[PDB]
Design a protein around this ligand. Structure first.
Ligand SMILES: [K+]
Ligand SMILES: [Mg+2]
Ligand SMILES: [Mg+2]
Ligand SMILES: [Mg+2]
Ligand SMILES: [Mg+2]
Ligand SMILES: [Mg+2]
Ligand SMILES: [Mg+2]
Ligand SMILES: [Mg+2]
Ligand SMILES: [Mg+2]
Ligand SMILES: [Mg+2]
Ligand SMILES: [Mg+2]
Ligand SMILES: [Mg+2]
Ligand SMILES: [Mg+2]
Ligand SMILES: [Mg+2]
Ligand SMILES: [Mg+2]
Ligand SMILES: [Mg+2]
Ligand SMILES: [Mg+2]
Ligand SMILES: [Mg+2]
Ligand SMILES: [Mg+2]
Ligand SMILES: [Mg+2]
Ligand SMILES: [Mg+2]
Ligand SMILES: [Mg+2]
Ligand SMILES: [Mg+2]
Ligand SMILES: [Mg+2]
Ligand SMILES: [Mg+2]
Ligand SMILES: [Mg+2]
Ligand SMILES: [Mg+2]
Ligand SMILES: [Mg+2]
Ligand SMILES: [Mg+2]
Ligand SMILES: [Mg+2]
Ligand SMILES: [Mg+2]
Ligand SMILES: [Mg+2]
Ligand SMILES: [Mg+2]
Ligand SMILES: [Mg+2]
Ligand SMILES: [Zn+2]
Ligand SMILES: [Zn+2]
Lengths: 91, 109, 97, 77, 114
RNA sequence: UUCAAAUGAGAACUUUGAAGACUGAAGUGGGGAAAGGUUCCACGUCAACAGCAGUUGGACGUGGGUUAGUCGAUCCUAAGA
RNA sequence: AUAUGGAUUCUUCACGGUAACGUAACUGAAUGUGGAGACGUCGGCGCGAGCCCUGGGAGGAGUUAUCUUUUCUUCUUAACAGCUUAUCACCCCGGAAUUGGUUUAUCCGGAGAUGGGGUCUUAUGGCUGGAAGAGGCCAGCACCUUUGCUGGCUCCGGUGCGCUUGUGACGGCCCGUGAAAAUCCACAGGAAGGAAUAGUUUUCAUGCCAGGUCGUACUGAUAACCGCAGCAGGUCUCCAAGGUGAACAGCCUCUAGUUGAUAGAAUAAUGUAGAUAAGGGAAGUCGGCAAAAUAGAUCCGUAACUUCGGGAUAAGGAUUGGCUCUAAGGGUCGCGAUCAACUUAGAACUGGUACGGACAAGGGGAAUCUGACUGUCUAAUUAAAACAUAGCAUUGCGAUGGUCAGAAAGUGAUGUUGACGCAAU
């Protein structure tokens, strides 16, 4: 059965701190506790250690990432920018 | 029931003051201080516990024969079997690729 | 089958004891399967004048025998002069003093 | 304390020439059938260890008692 | 000891003799662990003895992880009912097959002998 | 709290016995750390001290007592000096 | 320090296993690398130990008008050693969808599952040695002493959401990810040293010697410490039995300890502490201050409002003892046999309608002001609306810097820092 309508994981906080702050926290807690696809072994086994460290329970590979998600949009954009600059440099 | 006392002057429940209640041939309950448990030696490549290696406190390894501390293989009680095998395969394949790269460089010039 | 012997010679020869009544009390009061009196082919109490023998196939113990003997001595005001004492395993006697 | 089961090796132990004392202990055990067999423990005092040989046969025990060297301080009981 | 024997017989257990909650007296998690463990061990026993196959075992394993089974008796009657249903449906299959083939044999004989 | 005995010049208070109670194992139990420093124990012993008492005492007088390769310190480094 | 034995070597520095790895050994300098030391907290689950509970038996004791195969009590096994013993982990075979395995907790598998067969760590347990000769419990004796004997028995089980504790595999949490070093081992490497009327090996066994110095008594607190004292104050920690009960609550008890607080006699007023009270029910009072009422558990039922999480035990009802029964909920072995513990539900009967019978244990509701909340402070007259807080915003600063130290410095904090930072509001 669905136990809460909207609070989800932030039902641990009860009525405290304000609904907006609980919602903002909820989004990033879901992100930081999710399992992500490992780019090395292809399994959905990447979980966060401390903020910015994302380790695969299978293949034991750890990658530096965002505080609450494996890859920030800024990092993806930087990866694309560096790829473009490198391709221009090498060709 | 019989109650026990610490046998050392340390009265605090620290990591080095752990006790077990044992019954003696006198029929009485007595605390016996227990040493901290040993940690298994671990692979230097993957961190897993090394198979076939005795697990002792650090200085106890000076009091046991070589057989308890090693495994008859290329990295013994240092690296696990799978990590050693990966080292073998990587070394061989990378050396072969080095030869291939050298000849490709020589034949592309 | 287990055998339990009780040497009553000392109180008998000192005079204040009766082995026949002790054996009769044992037969009357030994319980079998909770019920008293049905020592049917499982418990035999026999008398020799100096040694009372109890041979048992049912549940029976030296502790139970001592319990019954102490009960008999208390009923007959015989304690403070007669002690039920084990000399060897399942061989007891009535020490008189 | 160490237990030994080889009779020849126990004899070598009694002859080790650092062993100066032994003790022959008699037990009254039951080997799971209720009859009281007689066990014999021969304990030779080595310098670092006490070696015990257990024989459950009184015949072999008497044979070894005879076979002990006459310089050993046998210490019956 | 006398009070313990009385409690074993079922006395001194009414609502006026209870002061902790039902969970405090016996955790529902403990009850659930006991029940799920007996169900899992019965399913393993049946699969290993061949009374059920591994596919029905997997279905029943998921169902037993779900509540879906009040006790070992409920699981056993469910398995018996499933096996009896399979028996009845296979019997009907065989009966229909036999009737079809026999009618077709009669028809073929009539045709080829006309 | 009580009864009796013993000791004593002297006993509500000492000792032994009996009885009645309590702490009720998060103790009024058994050990320790800091601190104290002999208070520990025995013998003798009551002027002072124990806000009554005292033959008793953590008192007074005189003595006895603390045994380690393995328990600690000692060694290591911590914040720091 | 050392000499034998063992091992090793004519293929000099061992063999066996496909492998995981095994072993009594089985060369190994510099140098390098790795491991151990070495690490949070909480939650459930598994296992162990000790304790608790309990059956049979072998003793001792208690009760015995009556009853009670009964009540109490002893029945124990150290460090160390050998063999053996795990979860996890790993190896070989094999190739998996009808996806399977599987935990209480949903993870795992073509990056090789399930399955079959193996390897390993030895927490831990078992057996044996230690070691019954010890300790325990008894009996029969002798007894002007030291006191001495003489014997017997010290056995075999069961149970668990039990308590305490150790541990394992996990899982939750973090803008928190939860010491260091001494020290010990291993590996890589291959310097060097190495055999045949013989060389090699004190990581195998046995053997020899030594281990200094200081502390060590006792209390550890309603009398050994501090508080002017033999002060109702304060002062860190370990062990922890039975019953009731959710319970380390309260109440009673076992082991152990204590019975110490100046006493005796009376029972006026006024007190201090504890209680009760007809009828009324806050009229008392600044004010319901104080007290009372409520209270456990089971079942029913639960409003406004709301940040949808709560409010909530809202409110408001009912029931509860004892006894005799009924039903359901398990293990193991081959439907049957056997073994085992509590929890739940129901029914009849029963009584001065009592029954969470002592103990223990919410009063509730409608609103306003105020501070969001948890938290913090005036030790010794103020606990609050004060402070803090998360959130919001502003400010400075790119290191030859901001802010702030220092008498000065070839001096410092932030800073093991770098704007998602530091500093100031
Ligand atoms: K090994
Ligand atoms: Mg090994
Ligand atoms: Mg509970
Ligand atoms: Mg639950
Ligand atoms: Mg007295
Ligand atoms: Mg009290
Ligand atoms: Mg009491
Ligand atoms: Mg004294
Ligand atoms: Mg005075
Ligand atoms: Mg005086
Ligand atoms: Mg005098
Ligand atoms: Mg003195
Ligand atoms: Mg030490
Ligand atoms: Mg060899
Ligand atoms: Mg497998
Ligand atoms: Mg604890
Ligand atoms: Mg001491
Ligand atoms: Mg002390
Ligand atoms: Mg104390
Ligand atoms: Mg003082
Ligand atoms: Mg209970
Ligand atoms: Mg009134
Ligand atoms: Mg009234
Ligand atoms: Mg009214
Ligand atoms: Mg008024
Ligand atoms: Mg008025
Ligand atoms: Mg007014
Ligand atoms: Mg009030
Ligand atoms: Mg209510
Ligand atoms: Mg309300
Ligand atoms: Mg506030
Ligand atoms: Mg104040
Ligand atoms: Mg105040
Ligand atoms: Mg404020
Ligand atoms: Zn991966
Ligand atoms: Zn590895």
């Amino acid at each position: 059965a669905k136990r809460t309508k909207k609070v989800g994981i932030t039902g641990k906080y009860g009525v405290r701190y304000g609904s907006s702050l609980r919602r903002q926290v909820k989004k990033l807690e879901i992100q930081q506790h999710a399992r992500y696809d490992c780019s090395f072994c292809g399994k959905k086994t990447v979980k966060r250690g401390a903020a910015g460290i994302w380790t695969c329970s299978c293949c034991k590979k750890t990658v530096a990432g965002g505080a609450y998600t494996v890859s920030t949009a800024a990092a993806a954009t930087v990866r694309s920018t560096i790829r473009r600059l490198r391709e221009m440099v090498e060709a | 029931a019989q109650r026990v006392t610490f046998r050392r002057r340390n009265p605090y429940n620290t990591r080095s003051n752990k006790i077990k209640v044992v019954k003696t041939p006198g029929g009485i309950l007595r605390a016996q201080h227990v040493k901290k448990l040993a940690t298994r030696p671990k692979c230097g490549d993957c961190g897993s516990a090394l198979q076939g290696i005795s697990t002792l406190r650090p200085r106890q390894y000076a009091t046991v024969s070589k057989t308890h501390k090693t495994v008859s293989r290329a990295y013994g009680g240092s690296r696990c079997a799978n990590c050693v095998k990966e080292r073998i395969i990587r070394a061989f394949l990378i050396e072969e690729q080095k030869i291939v790269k050298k000849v490709v460089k020589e034949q592309t010039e | 089958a287990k055998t339990f012997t009780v040497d009553v010679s000392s109180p008998t020869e000192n005079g204040v004891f009766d082995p026949a009544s002790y054996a009769k009390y044992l037969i009357d009061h030994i319980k079998v399967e909770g019920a008293v009196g049905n020592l049917g082919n499982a418990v035999t109490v026999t008398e020799d004048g100096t040694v009372v023998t109890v041979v048992s196939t049912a549940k029976f113990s030296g502790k139970y025998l001592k319990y019954l003997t102490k009960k008999y001595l208390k009923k007959n005001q015989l304690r403070d002069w007669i002690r039920f004492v084990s000399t060897k395993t399942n061989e007891y006697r009535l020490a008189f003093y | 304390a160490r237990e030994i089961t080889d009779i020849k090796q126990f004899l070598e132990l009694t002859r080790r020439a650092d062993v100066k004392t032994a003790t022959v202990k008699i037990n009254k055990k039951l080997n799971k059938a209720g009859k009281p067999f007689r066990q014999t423990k021969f304990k030779v005092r080595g310098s670092s260890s006490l070696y015990t040989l257990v024989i459950n046969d009184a015949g072999k025990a008497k044979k070894l008692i005879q076979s002990l060297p006459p310089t050993l301080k046998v210490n019956r009981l | 000891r006398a009070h313990a024997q009385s409690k074993r017989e079922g006395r001194h257990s009414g609502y006026g003799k209870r002061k902790g909650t039902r969970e405090a007296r016996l955790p529902s998690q403990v009850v659930w662990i006991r029940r799920l463990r007996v169900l899992r061990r019965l399913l393993a026993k049946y699969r290993d003895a061949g009374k059920i196959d591994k596919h029905l075992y997997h279905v029943l394993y998921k169902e037993s992880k779900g509540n879906a089974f009040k006790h070992k008796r409920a699981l056993v009657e469910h398995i018996i009912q499933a096996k009896a249903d399979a028996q009845r449906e296979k019997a009907l299959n065989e009966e229909a097959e036999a009737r079809r083939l026999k009618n077709r044999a009669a028809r073929d004989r009539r045709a080829q002998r006309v």
